[PDB]
């Protein structure tokens, strides 16, 4: 699961050191850099086996709740019955194999309220307060004796989208525990270039693309307070669409500029269309 990741080698190695210690990392960054992709591959790296079963991934939204996450009482045919959640059940599998590493991906964690979701468990999920010693009876636990304890093997990876203006402040409860990490677009890297060279792409078109995108992304990052650095465009669009072996050329490129980048600029530049026309043209002209 490590053949072609566009990100530099430094961060991906640092993360593995960072993750094995802190165990709760947040990956920031713009949409379209494969935040789901990189985390998924890293999940296989930490285990050393490219196995999905140990790994589970969820997308958070505001109405995502403790009931789905851990324990809830959905009705059966006659009467209400407790139902195990995802994280609750997920950990029971990890308890079987303490030697192995089990991994949980939480996409768009900033969107939902963590407190309503984790509830009691948010104290445990920090790396220190782990194991049977810190076990507590659960919210819906009928019997006091049954408890839930986060095993040390579990590692949690979270994806946060920097691009949104609507976001103002990260949740406080999140920041105390998790170690935020910034993912650059990494449009100018050897590994991404080497991918395109393997595909039917001339060297000038590669440097043409890298040169043009860098200055464009640099422009958005340059206006620091008005727009965050994380607004800068990612690279996943250029990855996708070439599974058929199509040659990457200016003819193919102009579609992606028009289809994906153009509405994205419209949202980023909601003030002046003239200023948009300045930047749309340079990519092709």
């Amino acid at each position: 699961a490590l053949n072609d990741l566009f990100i530099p080698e430094t961060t991906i190695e640092t993360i593995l050191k960072r993750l094995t210690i802190k165990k709760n990392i947040i990956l920031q960054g713009p949409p379209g850099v494969g935040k789901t992709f990189v985390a998924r591959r890293l999940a296989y790296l930490l285990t050393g086996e490219k196995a999905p079963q140990r790994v589970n991934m969820v997308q958070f939204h505001q109405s995502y709740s403790y009931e789905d996450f851990i324990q809830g009482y959905r009705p059966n045919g006659v009467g209400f019955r407790r139902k195990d959640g995802i994280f609750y059940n997920f950990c029971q599998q990890a308890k079987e194999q303490p030697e192995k590493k089990y991994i949980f991906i939480i996409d768009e964690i900033n969107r939902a309220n963590l407190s309503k979701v984790f509830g009691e468990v948010m104290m445990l999920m920090e790396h220190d307060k782990r194991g049977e010693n810190w076990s507590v009876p659960l919210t819906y636990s009928e019997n006091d004796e049954e408890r839930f304890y986060v095993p040390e093997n579990v590692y949690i990876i979270g994806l946060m989208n920097t691009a949104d203006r609507s976001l103002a402040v990260v949740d406080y409860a999140l920041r105390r525990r998790f170690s935020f990490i910034d993912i650059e677009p990494g449009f100018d890297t050897p590994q991404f270039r080497n991918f395109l060279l393997n595909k039917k792409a001339e060297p000038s078109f590669v440097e043409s693309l890298c040169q043009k995108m860098n200055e464009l992304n640099q422009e958005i990052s340059k206006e620091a307070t008005i727009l965050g650095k994380g607004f800068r465009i990612g690279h996943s669009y250029f990855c996708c669409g070439l599974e058929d072996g199509t040659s990457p050329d200016t003819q193919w490129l102009n579609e992606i500029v028009m289809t994906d980048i153009a509405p994205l600029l419209e949202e980023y530049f909601f003030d002046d269309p003239y200023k948009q026309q300045k930047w749309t043209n340079k990519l092709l002209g």
Binding site: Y73, R74, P75, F80
Partner: protein, 336 residues
């Protein structure tokens, strides 16, 4: 580098906003005056009582309050742990109008240049509003409040809060604020002056009728009947009476404050208003240019192109009532 005495400016803002002793305060600068009005102004409101607007609340509680929402109740199965989703009306002071006050006071405290007595009193008030939530203010918040449900008194301080927010700039420190040097820029001071008269005239000149009048060019063009490219022309004020009409163009210039050449560029607009304006009654047409001067006031009359036009000045910094007398004295002559 002459400017108006700051205490006098506040009176002009008052008519501009369309609605007390300022002699006591020793701080000439504007923010000292403005905060003392607000800081004292809030104290006036609480005596009568602040506005409490019923905010309906849909929440999950352990019991029946008001109206239970059956749908959300059953779907979330809240009945089982003895809870319902019920709608009721908590009474708070957490309204947008009241929230704005607290956020503004925080800015007032953070301001680097401010009287100590003023800052101390506000900090008490900030403590005295526990329930209300601080906010990061924008004009868009003020935009929502144009409905004006609130009382007449609330609208006064809210306009004050608008002045502070727009005229707040960070200074030495990251947190602290520093007030804008409002007087120095002519445009906003001029735009104040133009609004100052229009609302002023409605109050005192009850005899005459006062409205801003939109004007249309006499032109016709073969290319476009619209003539959109042509400049938009809307009077500053028109003060019409049965015996005589009068159009005024008033602006604040820095050059005129020096007692030489004269800056009367606005006059070029005036004649064109007279031309496009055609009276059905045909009583008369008159024009006035009035500017602010500091030392003294001088009045002239002219007969230019078949029009009787007056150029006049007012000695701002004199005294507010004598100024008020002077304004009525001035208009009385020309309104004839």
């Amino acid at each position: 580098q002459p400017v108006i005495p700051v205490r006098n400016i506040y009176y002009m803002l008052t008519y501009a906003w369309g609605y007390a002793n300022l002699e006591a305060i020793p701080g000439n600068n504007l923010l000292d005056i403005l905060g003392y009005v607000l800081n004292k102004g809030v104290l006036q409101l609480s005596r009568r009582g602040l506005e409490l607007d019923y905010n309906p609340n849909t929440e999950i509680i352990p019991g029946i309050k008001g109206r239970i929402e059956f749908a959300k109740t059953i779907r979330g199965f809240h009945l089982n742990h003895g809870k319902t989703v019920s709608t009721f009306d908590m009474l708070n002071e957490d309204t947008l109008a009241n929230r704005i006050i607290k956020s503004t006071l925080a800015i007032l405290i953070k301001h680097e240049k401010l009287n100590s007595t003023i800052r101390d009193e506000a900090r008490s008030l900030y403590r005295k509003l526990p329930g209300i939530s601080t906010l990061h203010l924008t004009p868009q918040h003020f935009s929502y409040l144009n409905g004006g449900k609130n009382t007449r008194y609330y609208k006064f301080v809210i306009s004050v809060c608008k002045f502070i927010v727009n005229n707040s700039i960070p200074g030495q420190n990251k947190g602290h604020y520093r007030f804008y040097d409002f007087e120095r820029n002519e445009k906003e001071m001029s735009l104040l002056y133009q609004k100052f008269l229009y609302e002023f005239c409605r109050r005192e000149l009850t005899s005459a009728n006062t409205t801003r009048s939109y004007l249309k060019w006499d032109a016709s063009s073969i290319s476009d009947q619209s003539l959109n490219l042509l400049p938009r022309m809307e009077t500053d004020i028109t003060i019409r009476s049965s015996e005589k009409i009068l159009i005024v163009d008033a602006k604040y210039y820095k050059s005129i404050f020096s007692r030489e050449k004269f800056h009367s560029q606005n006059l070029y607009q005036l004649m064109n208003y007279l031309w496009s304006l055609k009276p059905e009654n045909g009583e008369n047409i008159g024009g006035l240019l009035i500017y602010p001067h500091v030392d003294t006031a001088v009045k002239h009359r002219y007969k230019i192109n078949g029009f009787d036009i007056g150029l006049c000045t007012v000695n701002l910094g004199q005294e507010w009532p004598c100024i008020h007398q002077e304004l009525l004295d001035i208009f009385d002559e020309y309104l004839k």
